[PDB]
Design a binder for this molecule. Structure first.
Ligand SMILES: [Ca+2]
Ligand SMILES: [Ca+2]
Ligand SMILES: [Ca+2]
Ligand SMILES: [Ca+2]
Ligand SMILES: [Ca+2]
Ligand SMILES: [Ca+2]
Ligand SMILES: [Ca+2]
Ligand SMILES: [Ca+2]
Lengths: 173, 173
């Protein structure tokens, strides 16, 4: 069964301390993207992986346990499919005019101002976003959405935080 | 005069569009750290530089204007001196027990929980933080402190933000 083998894959990757570190994540992600040249990327750098691990480290162990990893992994599989689905011109990258569609297909409805911010931070000089940038952006985006929602359970449209919560949320990412 | 030559240095680095991009920043920072082997680092990666630029891009031009760059540059000079001052064992890295002193010397008084979060995100398996990590952490930390303060001018100890402000603040960094 697929479930059983994924479980084994995690155990194999996590190794000795049984959790996946940012370095362990980087290695499996780069080794996997290489098998997909149709996904333009300069690779998953260590800093990007430490950001993805932190944002996914809900139990604050510093690394990814099975569930955290499973969630991340499935999200990546889903976003990888979307990435290719919306790269209509086969540039191997998500361009400025393909981004809104890709994000909305991933379940994220942002506005013009937010999209421009995203492009400025995760896209290149030509408004192009490669695969590792696309994936890390969405991992972070999904996480920031979840964080806001969990802090606004009554749906008031606003959250209130002190400096310690603020720094924990913004720095550990 | 030093002021005049720094102004020229910025103009030279910013080039054609007269602002310093993340790539332009990365290049000058790496070319400068190399002249200091006493500063252990795997170098300033592009993703780290895009994070530093975004967090410093107060006018949201996507790049660093003279003032933004000047502020960043002076901060780095100041933190570089502190980095060496507190690396008492000359490991070329700021270790777990040197961190609190370094940060407090930089004007940041955090608590145990915040420091542990920092170590988990910016230090290595051995609790060691290299130069590029140290600098990018403080750039971000200083920025998150300023952002909170500007949103809490009455000093109530809390800020209240909607989802759009939240995402702008957390994603553009
Ligand atoms: Ca491990
Ligand atoms: Ca964890
Ligand atoms: Ca495309
Ligand atoms: Ca990239
Ligand atoms: Ca420029
Ligand atoms: Ca700017
Ligand atoms: Ca040291
Ligand atoms: Ca580093």
């Amino acid at each position: 069964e697929e479930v059983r083998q994924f479980r084994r894959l995690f155990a194999q990757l996590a190794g000795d301390d049984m959790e996946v570190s940012a370095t362990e994540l980087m290695n499996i992600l780069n080794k996997v993207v290489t098998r997909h040249p149709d996904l333009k990327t300069d690779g998953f750098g260590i800093d990007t992986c430490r950001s993805m691990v932190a944002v996914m480290d809900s139990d604050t162990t510093g690394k990814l346990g099975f569930e955290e990893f499973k969630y991340l992994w499935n999200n990546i599989k889903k976003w990888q499919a979307i990435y290719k689905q919306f790269d209509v011109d086969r540039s191997g990258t998500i361009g400025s005019s393909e981004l809104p569609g890709a994000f909305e297909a991933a379940g994220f409805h942002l506005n013009e101002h937010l999209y421009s911010m995203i492009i400025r931070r995760y896209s290149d000089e030509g408004g192009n976003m490669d695969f590792d940038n696309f994936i890390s952006c969405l991992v972070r985006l999904d996480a920031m959405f979840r964080a806001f929602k969990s802090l606004d359970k009554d749906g008031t449209g606003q959250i209130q935080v002190n400096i310690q919560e603020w720094l924990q949320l913004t720095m550990y990412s």
